[PDB]
Write an enzyme that holds these catalytic residues in place. Sequence first.
Site, PDB file in Angstrom:
ATOM      1  N   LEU A 148      58.665  45.653   3.982  1.00 41.20           N
ATOM      2  CA  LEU A 148      58.126  44.259   3.648  1.00 41.20           C
ATOM      3  C   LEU A 148      56.723  44.438   2.917  1.00 41.20           C
ATOM      4  O   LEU A 148      56.506  44.057   1.860  1.00 41.20           O
ATOM      5  CB  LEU A 148      57.935  43.238   4.585  1.00 41.20           C
ATOM      6  CG  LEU A 148      59.341  42.820   5.538  1.00 41.20           C
ATOM      7  CD1 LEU A 148      58.956  42.020   6.658  1.00 41.20           C
ATOM      8  CD2 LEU A 148      59.973  42.025   4.676  1.00 41.20           C
ATOM      9  N   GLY A 149      55.812  45.078   3.883  1.00 40.18           N
ATOM     10  CA  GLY A 149      54.587  45.673   3.259  1.00 40.18           C
ATOM     11  C   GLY A 149      54.080  46.993   3.847  1.00 40.18           C
ATOM     12  O   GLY A 149      54.754  47.772   4.434  1.00 40.18           O
TER      13      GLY A 149
ATOM     14  N   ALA B  31      47.305  51.172   5.335  1.00 43.24           N
ATOM     15  CA  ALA B  31      46.721  52.523   5.606  1.00 43.24           C
ATOM     16  C   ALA B  31      47.143  53.152   6.992  1.00 43.24           C
ATOM     17  O   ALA B  31      47.908  53.871   7.194  1.00 43.24           O
ATOM     18  CB  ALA B  31      45.134  52.538   5.492  1.00 43.24           C
TER      19      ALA B  31
ATOM     20  N   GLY C 126      49.322  51.698   8.795  1.00 43.44           N
ATOM     21  CA  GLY C 126      50.375  51.180   8.840  1.00 43.44           C
ATOM     22  C   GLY C 126      51.322  51.003   7.628  1.00 43.44           C
ATOM     23  O   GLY C 126      51.187  51.914   6.540  1.00 43.44           O
TER      24      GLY C 126
ATOM     25  N   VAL D  98      54.771  48.054   7.120  1.00 44.43           N
ATOM     26  CA  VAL D  98      55.702  46.897   7.707  1.00 44.43           C
ATOM     27  C   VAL D  98      57.176  46.815   7.212  1.00 44.43           C
ATOM     28  O   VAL D  98      57.459  46.895   5.978  1.00 44.43           O
ATOM     29  CB  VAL D  98      54.966  45.522   7.620  1.00 44.43           C
ATOM     30  CG1 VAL D  98      55.815  44.414   8.408  1.00 44.43           C
ATOM     31  CG2 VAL D  98      53.353  45.644   8.345  1.00 44.43           C
TER      32      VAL D  98
ATOM     33  N   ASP E 200      37.669  38.720   9.611  1.00 42.89           N
ATOM     34  CA  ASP E 200      38.491  38.710   8.303  1.00 42.89           C
ATOM     35  C   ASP E 200      39.392  37.621   7.981  1.00 42.89           C
ATOM     36  O   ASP E 200      40.812  37.622   7.677  1.00 42.89           O
ATOM     37  CB  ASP E 200      39.222  40.108   8.050  1.00 42.89           C
ATOM     38  CG  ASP E 200      39.601  40.264   6.797  1.00 42.89           C
ATOM     39  OD1 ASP E 200      39.109  39.786   5.934  1.00 42.89           O
ATOM     40  OD2 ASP E 200      40.204  41.405   6.565  1.00 42.89           O
TER      41      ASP E 200
ATOM     42  N   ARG F  36      45.040  35.495   2.870  1.00 43.63           N
ATOM     43  CA  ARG F  36      45.953  36.725   2.890  1.00 43.63           C
ATOM     44  C   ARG F  36      46.142  37.343   4.303  1.00 43.63           C
ATOM     45  O   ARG F  36      47.130  37.968   4.635  1.00 43.63           O
ATOM     46  CB  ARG F  36      45.248  38.035   2.031  1.00 43.63           C
ATOM     47  CG  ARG F  36      43.981  38.253   2.477  1.00 43.63           C
ATOM     48  CD  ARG F  36      43.252  39.215   1.897  1.00 43.63           C
ATOM     49  NE  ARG F  36      41.996  39.441   2.693  1.00 43.63           N
ATOM     50  CZ  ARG F  36      40.871  38.927   2.383  1.00 43.63           C
ATOM     51  NH1 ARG F  36      40.617  38.103   1.424  1.00 43.63           N
ATOM     52  NH2 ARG F  36      39.963  39.340   3.235  1.00 43.63           N
ATOM     53  N   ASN F  37      45.541  36.743   5.295  1.00 47.76           N
ATOM     54  CA  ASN F  37      45.554  36.909   6.791  1.00 47.76           C
ATOM     55  C   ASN F  37      46.379  35.949   7.558  1.00 47.76           C
ATOM     56  O   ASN F  37      46.467  35.926   8.862  1.00 47.76           O
ATOM     57  CB  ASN F  37      44.097  37.551   7.472  1.00 47.76           C
ATOM     58  CG  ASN F  37      43.959  38.963   6.817  1.00 47.76           C
ATOM     59  OD1 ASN F  37      44.664  39.568   6.653  1.00 47.76           O
ATOM     60  ND2 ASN F  37      42.611  39.211   6.626  1.00 47.76           N
TER      61      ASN F  37
ATOM     62  N   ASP G 101      46.033  39.592  11.220  1.00 44.40           N
ATOM     63  CA  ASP G 101      44.958  40.267  10.807  1.00 44.40           C
ATOM     64  C   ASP G 101      45.251  41.473  10.274  1.00 44.40           C
ATOM     65  O   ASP G 101      45.859  42.498  11.075  1.00 44.40           O
ATOM     66  CB  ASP G 101      43.768  40.608  11.827  1.00 44.40           C
ATOM     67  CG  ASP G 101      42.401  41.125  11.412  1.00 44.40           C
ATOM     68  OD1 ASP G 101      41.390  41.369  11.962  1.00 44.40           O
ATOM     69  OD2 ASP G 101      42.320  41.508   9.789  1.00 44.40           O
TER      70      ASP G 101
HETATM   71  C1  LIG Z   1      57.383  39.594   2.293  1.00 47.13           C
HETATM   72  C2  LIG Z   1      56.577  39.649   3.675  1.00 47.13           C
HETATM   73  N1  LIG Z   1      57.441  38.842   4.359  1.00 47.13           N
HETATM   74  C3  LIG Z   1      56.756  38.737   5.939  1.00 47.13           C
HETATM   75  C4  LIG Z   1      55.956  39.468   6.342  1.00 47.13           C
HETATM   76  N2  LIG Z   1      55.219  39.728   7.494  1.00 47.13           N
HETATM   77  C5  LIG Z   1      55.657  39.278   8.713  1.00 47.13           C
HETATM   78  O1  LIG Z   1      56.699  38.304   8.702  1.00 47.13           O
HETATM   79  N3  LIG Z   1      55.019  39.526   9.887  1.00 47.13           N
HETATM   80  C6  LIG Z   1      53.988  40.304   9.868  1.00 47.13           C
HETATM   81  C7  LIG Z   1      53.586  40.428  11.276  1.00 47.13           C
HETATM   82  C8  LIG Z   1      52.558  41.158  11.588  1.00 47.13           C
HETATM   83  C9  LIG Z   1      52.011  41.844  10.608  1.00 47.13           C
HETATM   84  C10 LIG Z   1      52.475  41.867   9.253  1.00 47.13           C
HETATM   85  N4  LIG Z   1      53.534  40.925   8.839  1.00 47.13           N
HETATM   86  C11 LIG Z   1      55.071  40.395   5.067  1.00 47.13           C
HETATM   87  C12 LIG Z   1      53.971  41.023   5.361  1.00 47.13           C
HETATM   88  C13 LIG Z   1      54.014  42.639   5.349  1.00 47.13           C
HETATM   89  C14 LIG Z   1      52.802  43.339   5.642  1.00 47.13           C
HETATM   90  C15 LIG Z   1      51.457  42.628   5.890  1.00 47.13           C
HETATM   91  C16 LIG Z   1      51.613  41.186   5.918  1.00 47.13           C
HETATM   92  C17 LIG Z   1      52.584  40.508   5.661  1.00 47.13           C
HETATM   93  N5  LIG Z   1      55.418  40.354   3.963  1.00 47.13           N
END
Ligand SMILES: Cc1ncc(NC(=O)Nc2ccccn2)c(-c2ccccc2)n1
Length: 291
Positions: free
Chosen positions: A17-18, A21, A23, A25, A146, A150-151, A164
């Site tokens: 998904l993301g 550094a 990490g 996701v 922060d 975006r957070n 965060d």
């Molecule tokens: C496309 C998309 N859908 C969902 C996302 N995230 C989540 O559903 N949960 C979550 C929980 C904790 C930390 C990061 N994300 C994210 C995303 C990915 C990386 C960082 C920010 C958000 N991106």
Amino acid sequence: ACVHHIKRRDIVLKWELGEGAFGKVFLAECHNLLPEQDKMLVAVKALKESARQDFQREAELLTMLQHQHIVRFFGVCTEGRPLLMVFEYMRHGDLNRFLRSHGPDAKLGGEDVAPGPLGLGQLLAVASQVAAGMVYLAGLHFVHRDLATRNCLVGQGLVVKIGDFGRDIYSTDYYRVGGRTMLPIRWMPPESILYRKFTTESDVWSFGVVLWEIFTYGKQPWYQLSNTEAIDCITQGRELERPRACPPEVYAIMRGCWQREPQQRHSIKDVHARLQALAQAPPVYLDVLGH
Ligand SMILES: Cc1ncc(NC(=O)Nc2ccccn2)c(-c2ccccc2)n1
């Protein structure tokens, strides 16, 4: 360490998904996490990796902060490597991309949102949700540092929650100092830029900037300026203009988050009450607010 644990056999990665550094996701399937659910979707963060001790204190801190407008944390998976942190999956991604994709600068599907740019009532429901999360953190005497759209994450039913992360398509939202250390300058109050002081009072300045982002449909604050040009006018008392989509009543809330003297700012319990009232306001009263 009252940190909840998950066994690696209970987690099934689907796709990424993301990334960052410390990490990267993944969207995954988690079994026996919530009763009656059997199997549910989660967002799994695989950690970079001696920062295991840093990871542990972070896990203990995320266990502590559990609320309705805080991104839910389920537990860690320490059995084997990489170390994993498990969180709730949020269908719409982060609040910044959500705002930009439901703005007047978007090209185009309607389950949670109506056609076209988000309405005033939607924008206010989004702002009140972030404020409710900030009330909880200030209540626990926790300073975010922060706070930015975006957070924040958006889920099914336009539920907005604070997190965060580390971002990285948001590198221009930070000012690089000592070749490693980064600052969200555009979101910081003068006392943070000048004196390096970060408190509850400084978070309300940041929430005020979040309020401006919501109403500008996720545009960068001081976008027209460079990082030094931005530091100059933040430290020189220059305020962000009223967004086109923002009524004067809401701009009065932002302005009050931006009172230079930290102590002279409104509490987050206040800002939330003022935003909740406007979100829960009938269409007749809101139609009068929109000109
Ligand atoms: C496309 C998309 N859908 C969902 C996302 N995230 C989540 O559903 N949960 C979550 C929980 C904790 C930390 C990061 N994300 C994210 C995303 C990915 C990386 C960082 C920010 C958000 N991106």
